[PDB]
C-alpha cells in the first residue's frame, strides 16, 4: 500500500468513493480541496480515472536542516 495525496473537485468527490478502489482515508484537509489516502500501489491508475480526482501526488520526504 502506498500513501498519496489527491487534489479533488469537491463537486464530484465523496470520501466513501475511496473504499471502492481498495483504499482508505487518512486525512481530509479542512482548508484546501485535498485528501490523504492509503491505496494499493496498483490502484494509483484507478484514482486517476476518477472524475473527482484532478491530481494524485506521491507523499514526499522532507528532512531537518
Amino acid at each position: 500500500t502506498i500513501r498519496v495525496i489527491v487534489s479533488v473537485d469537491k463537486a464530484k468527490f465523496n470520501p466513501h468513493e475511496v473504499l471502492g478502489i481498495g483504499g482508505h482515508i487518512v486525512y481530509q484537509f479542512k482548508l484546501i480541496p485535498a485528501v490523504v489516502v492509503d491505496v494499493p500501489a496498483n490502484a494509483v491508475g484507478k484514482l486517476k480515472k476518477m472524475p473527482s480526482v484532478e491530481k494524485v501526488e506521491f507523499d514526499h520526504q522532507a528532512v531537518l536542516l
Binding site: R3, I5, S7, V26, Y27, F29, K30, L31, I32, A34, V36, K55, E57, D59, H60, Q61, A62, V63, L64, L65
Partner: protein
C-alpha cells in the same frame, strides 16, 4: 541548571536591546514551530509553550507523549526563538513569545510532506480547530482567533507539490509570516518550502560574518547558523549548525515586529513580498533594516542581509 548566557547569535541579530519595548509576550501573538517536537517541561522553555500538537502519520494528536521531542532539533530551534530570560540556560530572540510546537518530523528528523501540510493547517486552525471563528477574514492578528502569526520551518525537501503549495498560500492569506531554512547542500537556490515566494528563505552566517559553505544560495535574508547554542533535551543545552538554526532567529525577529506593532497599534502588519523595500510590511522592514553584508544590495550569499531586531522594531513603530 547553568547560569544564563546570551548566545552570540542572539547578540548578532540585536535582540537584547528590543526587550525593553517587548519580549513578544503580547497575547494575540503565537509562533508555530513545525519540527521534531519539543522537550515541553524544559525549565528554560515551559512557560512559553502554549500548545503542543503532533501530525505524525496523518494523525492529529495533542497527547504530550506524542508531541515530545525524540531527536532534539525542535527543542533547539524553539530555544533560539523563545528561551526564557531568567537566571538559567540561554535566551531567545523573543523570550516571552508564546510557542505552538507542531511535531511534523519523527525521531529521525524526517517527515512526510503530508504531515507537514497538516501541520501548517493546524497552525492556522489553532487549538479551537477553526481558522476564522467570527468570519471577518482576519485570522493572524485577530484576538478572537487563535491562529499563529508566524510559521517557522527549519526543514525542507526537493519536491514542489501543489497541495503543499496550496496550504502555504492559505497560510499567507491568513496573514501569517512564513519562514523557512534555505537548505544545507551549498546549492544554488533554496529547498522547498523556502523557495516559494510566500515564504522567507533564510541562509546561515558564522560568527565572523561569513556565509556558511553549506548554506543554500539565494535566500531572502540570513542569520546566525554556525555554533549556535540553545536548549536541547532533556532539560539540557547543545551547540549545532545549519540553516535550521538560522531560521528561528528570523522567526524571532518577526515575532518582535508583530508584537511591538500590535502593542502600539492594535493591529499587525501585512506579510509583504520578496521585492518589498518599504516600511509598510514585515518583509519590507526585514529587508531595509537587514545588515547588508557582501556586495552592496541583495546578493546570492546573504540575501538582503543579516536580520536586526533593534532596527526592525524601530522602523515598525516609527
Amino acid at each position: 541548571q547553568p547560569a544564563q548566557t546570551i548566545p552570540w547569535g542572539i547578540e548578532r541579530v540585536k535582540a537584547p536591546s528590543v526587550w525593553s519595548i517587548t519580549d513578544g509576550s503580547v497575547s494575540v501573538i503565537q509562533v508555530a514551530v513545525l519540527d521534531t517536537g519539543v522537550d515541553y517541561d524544559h525549565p528554560d522553555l515551559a512557560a512559553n509553550i502554549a500548545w503542543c500538537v503532533s501530525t505524525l502519520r496523518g494523525k492529529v494528536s495533542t497527547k504530550l507523549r506524542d508531541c515530545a521531542d525524540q531527536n532534539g532539533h525542535g527543542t533547539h530551534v524553539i530555544g533560539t526563538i523563545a528561551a526564557l530570560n531568567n537566571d538559567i540556560g540561554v535566551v531567545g530572540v523573543a523570550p516571552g513569545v508564546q510557542i505552538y510546537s507542531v511535531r511534523v518530523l519523527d525521531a529521525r528528523g524526517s517527515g512526510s510532506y503530508s504531515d507537514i501540510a497538516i501541520g501548517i493547517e493546524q497552525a492556522i486552525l489553532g487549538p479551537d480547530g477553526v481558522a476564522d471563528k467570527d468570519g471577518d477574514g482576519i485570522i493572524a492578528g485577530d484576538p478572537d482567533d487563535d491562529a499563529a502569526e508566524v510559521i517557522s520551518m527549519s526543514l525542507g525537501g526537493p519536491a514542489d507539490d501543489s497541495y503543499l503549495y496550496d496550504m502555504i498560500i492559505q497560510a499567507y492569506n491568513a496573514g501569517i509570516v512564513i519562514v523557512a531554512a534555505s537548505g544545507n547542500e551549498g546549492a544554488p537556490s533554496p529547498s522547498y518550502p523556502a523557495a516559494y515566494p510566500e515564504v522567507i528563505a533564510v541562509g546561515a552566517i558564522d560568527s565572523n560574518d561569513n556565509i556558511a559553505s553549506f548554506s543554500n544560495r539565494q535566500p531572502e535574508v540570513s542569520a546566525p547558523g554556525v555554533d549556535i547554542l540553545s536548549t536541547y533535551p532533556d532539560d539540557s543545552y547543545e551547540t549545532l549548525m545549519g540553516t535550521a538554526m538560522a531560521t528561528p532567529h528570523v522567526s524571532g525577529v518577526v515575532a518582535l515586529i508583530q508584537a511591538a506593532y500590535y502593542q502600539k497599534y492594535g493591529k499587525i502588519l501585512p506579510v509583504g513580498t520578496f521585492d518589498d523595500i518599504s516600511k509598510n510590511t514585515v518583509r519590507g522592514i526585514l529587508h531595509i533594516t537587514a545588515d547588508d553584508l557582501g556586495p552592496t544590495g541583495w546578493d546570492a550569499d546573504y540575501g538582503y542581509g543579516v536580520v536586526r531586531a533593534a532596527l526592525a522594531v524601530q522602523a515598525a513603530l516609527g
